[PDB]
Scaffold this motif. Structure first.
Motif, mmCIF file in Angstrom:
data_model
loop_
_atom_site.group_PDB
_atom_site.id
_atom_site.type_symbol
_atom_site.label_atom_id
_atom_site.label_comp_id
_atom_site.label_asym_id
_atom_site.label_seq_id
_atom_site.Cartn_x
_atom_site.Cartn_y
_atom_site.Cartn_z
ATOM 1 N N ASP A 76 63.994 20.602 -51.937
ATOM 2 C CA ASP A 76 64.965 21.665 -52.170
ATOM 3 C C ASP A 76 64.551 22.539 -53.346
ATOM 4 O O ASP A 76 64.779 23.753 -53.337
ATOM 5 N N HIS A 77 63.945 21.939 -54.372
ATOM 6 C CA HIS A 77 63.468 22.720 -55.509
ATOM 7 C C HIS A 77 62.333 23.651 -55.101
ATOM 8 O O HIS A 77 62.291 24.811 -55.526
ATOM 9 N N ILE A 78 61.406 23.161 -54.276
ATOM 10 C CA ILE A 78 60.290 23.988 -53.825
ATOM 11 C C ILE A 78 60.798 25.215 -53.077
ATOM 12 O O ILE A 78 60.257 26.318 -53.224
ATOM 13 N N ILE A 79 61.845 25.047 -52.268
ATOM 14 C CA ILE A 79 62.294 26.134 -51.401
ATOM 15 C C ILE A 79 62.852 27.287 -52.227
ATOM 16 O O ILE A 79 62.529 28.457 -51.985
ATOM 17 N N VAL A 80 63.691 26.981 -53.214
ATOM 18 C CA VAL A 80 64.355 28.040 -53.968
ATOM 19 C C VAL A 80 63.527 28.512 -55.163
ATOM 20 O O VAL A 80 63.595 29.690 -55.529
ATOM 21 N N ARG A 81 62.741 27.629 -55.780
ATOM 22 C CA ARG A 81 61.965 28.028 -56.948
ATOM 23 C C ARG A 81 60.646 28.692 -56.577
ATOM 24 O O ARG A 81 60.171 29.558 -57.318
ATOM 25 N N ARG A 85 60.929 32.757 -53.948
ATOM 26 C CA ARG A 85 60.352 33.732 -54.866
ATOM 27 C C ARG A 85 59.121 34.402 -54.264
ATOM 28 O O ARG A 85 58.965 35.624 -54.361
ATOM 29 N N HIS A 86 58.232 33.619 -53.643
ATOM 30 C CA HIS A 86 57.060 34.202 -52.995
ATOM 31 C C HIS A 86 57.463 35.270 -51.986
ATOM 32 O O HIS A 86 56.805 36.311 -51.873
ATOM 33 N N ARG A 87 58.540 35.023 -51.237
ATOM 34 C CA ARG A 87 58.977 35.972 -50.218
ATOM 35 C C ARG A 87 59.435 37.289 -50.829
ATOM 36 O O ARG A 87 59.348 38.335 -50.176
ATOM 37 N N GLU A 88 59.927 37.262 -52.067
ATOM 38 C CA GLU A 88 60.345 38.480 -52.752
ATOM 39 C C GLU A 88 59.202 39.129 -53.520
ATOM 40 O O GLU A 88 59.104 40.359 -53.564
ATOM 41 N N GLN A 89 58.325 38.322 -54.117
ATOM 42 C CA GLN A 89 57.322 38.856 -55.028
ATOM 43 C C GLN A 89 56.151 39.503 -54.299
ATOM 44 O O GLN A 89 55.579 40.474 -54.804
ATOM 45 N N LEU A 90 55.783 39.002 -53.126
ATOM 46 C CA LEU A 90 54.570 39.490 -52.479
ATOM 47 C C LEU A 90 54.776 40.858 -51.840
ATOM 48 O O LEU A 90 53.901 41.725 -51.958
ATOM 49 N N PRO A 91 55.892 41.098 -51.148
ATOM 50 C CA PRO A 91 56.152 42.470 -50.680
ATOM 51 C C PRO A 91 56.152 43.482 -51.812
ATOM 52 O O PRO A 91 55.665 44.607 -51.640
ATOM 53 N N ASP A 198 50.416 31.832 -61.108
ATOM 54 C CA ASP A 198 50.971 30.698 -61.840
ATOM 55 C C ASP A 198 51.939 29.908 -60.968
ATOM 56 O O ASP A 198 51.834 28.681 -60.858
ATOM 57 N N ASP A 199 52.897 30.598 -60.344
ATOM 58 C CA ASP A 199 53.870 29.913 -59.499
ATOM 59 C C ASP A 199 53.191 29.223 -58.324
ATOM 60 O O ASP A 199 53.541 28.092 -57.970
ATOM 61 N N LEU A 200 52.217 29.889 -57.705
ATOM 62 C CA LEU A 200 51.622 29.349 -56.488
ATOM 63 C C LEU A 200 50.838 28.075 -56.775
ATOM 64 O O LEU A 200 50.839 27.146 -55.961
ATOM 65 N N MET A 201 50.176 28.002 -57.933
ATOM 66 C CA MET A 201 49.423 26.798 -58.268
ATOM 67 C C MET A 201 50.352 25.652 -58.653
ATOM 68 O O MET A 201 50.117 24.501 -58.267
ATOM 69 N N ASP A 202 51.406 25.941 -59.421
ATOM 70 C CA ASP A 202 52.436 24.933 -59.656
ATOM 71 C C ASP A 202 53.088 24.513 -58.345
ATOM 72 O O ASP A 202 53.395 23.333 -58.141
ATOM 73 N N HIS A 203 53.312 25.476 -57.449
ATOM 74 C CA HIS A 203 53.858 25.174 -56.130
ATOM 75 C C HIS A 203 52.937 24.231 -55.363
ATOM 76 O O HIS A 203 53.363 23.168 -54.897
ATOM 77 N N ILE A 204 51.662 24.599 -55.231
ATOM 78 C CA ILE A 204 50.718 23.747 -54.516
ATOM 79 C C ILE A 204 50.521 22.429 -55.254
ATOM 80 O O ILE A 204 50.410 21.365 -54.632
ATOM 81 N N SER A 205 50.475 22.471 -56.586
ATOM 82 C CA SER A 205 50.300 21.241 -57.352
ATOM 83 C C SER A 205 51.428 20.259 -57.069
ATOM 84 O O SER A 205 51.192 19.063 -56.864
ATOM 85 N N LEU A 206 52.669 20.749 -57.060
ATOM 86 C CA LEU A 206 53.810 19.876 -56.811
ATOM 87 C C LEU A 206 53.744 19.245 -55.425
ATOM 88 O O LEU A 206 54.179 18.103 -55.243
ATOM 89 N N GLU A 207 53.202 19.963 -54.440
ATOM 90 C CA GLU A 207 53.106 19.422 -53.087
ATOM 91 C C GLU A 207 51.920 18.471 -52.953
ATOM 92 O O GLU A 207 52.065 17.349 -52.458
#
Ligand SMILES: [Fe+3]
Ligand SMILES: [Fe+3]
Ligand SMILES: [O]
Length: 219
Positions: A76-81, A85-91, A198-207
């Protein structure tokens, strides 16, 4: 002794150690099992200095240790954090890069092809995150994580594909460093790119370093 620990555990255990590894272009996300010793050797870095920098950071504990948190709360944390965010930041980044490549088409330092690579990242991330949310994450919530070697290996391969795009994006932007010519739009876009990386590596790291190995282990 920090040199004998894997990068992932140091990133998840030491506050702001993630930002330190990004300063050294060390891949704690997809190459998190790699020990700090083998990572500093690869890049010809003085490991003893990195150990002292981590020692300073390690004085304080990390705000939230996900290594032992419930898998459902990690998901649940991955989805909202991260996913949302990726869906908003990349466009937003795609449109900025489009504006910068045109407005500054004549400058030599302009990052040509950035829009193309951000678009590729957005398309692959979009499909990737949909598969995790619609297939893998529910599988893990139902307690079937031990039967998920297949899906997880496919997701980890896509994590690698995304890592290669990040490296292309970092090269096209001089490691996301704006030139002295950079206007405000140009500088704010690079700040957004660094925030995404930064977010994407923390994201991938957490997974890769927590959610997946613990799911496979039956937690
Ligand atoms: Fe994800
Ligand atoms: Fe993922
Ligand atoms: O992801």
């Amino acid at each position: 002794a920090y040199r004998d620990q894997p990068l992932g555990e140091l990133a998840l255990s030491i506050p702001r150690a993630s930002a330190l590894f990004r300063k050294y272009d060390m891949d704690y996300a997809a190459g998190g099992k790699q020990t700090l010793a083998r990572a500093a050797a690869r890049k010809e870095l003085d490991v003893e200095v990195i150990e002292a920098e981590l020692a300073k950071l390690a004085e304080q504990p990390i705000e939230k240790d996900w290594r032992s948190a419930p898998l459902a709360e990690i998901i649940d944390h991955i989805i909202v954090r991260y996913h949302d965010r990726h869906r908003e930041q990349l466009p937003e980044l795609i449109l900025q890069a489009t504006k910068v490549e045109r407005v500054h088409a004549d400058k030599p330092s302009v990052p040509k092809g950035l829009t193309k690579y951000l678009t590729m990242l957005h398309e692959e991330l979009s499909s990737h995150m949909m598969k995790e949310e619609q297939i893998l994450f529910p599988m893990i919530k139902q307690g079937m994580g031990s039967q998920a070697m297949g899906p997880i290996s496919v997701m980890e391969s896509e994590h690698d594909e995304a890592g290669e795009l990040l490296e292309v994006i970092k090269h096209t932007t001089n490691n996301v460093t704006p030139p002295p010519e950079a206007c405000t739009t140009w500088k704010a876009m690079y700040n957004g790119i660094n925030e995404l990386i930064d977010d994407l590596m923390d994201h991938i790291s957490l997974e890769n370093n927590v959610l997946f190995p613990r799911a496979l282990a039956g937690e």
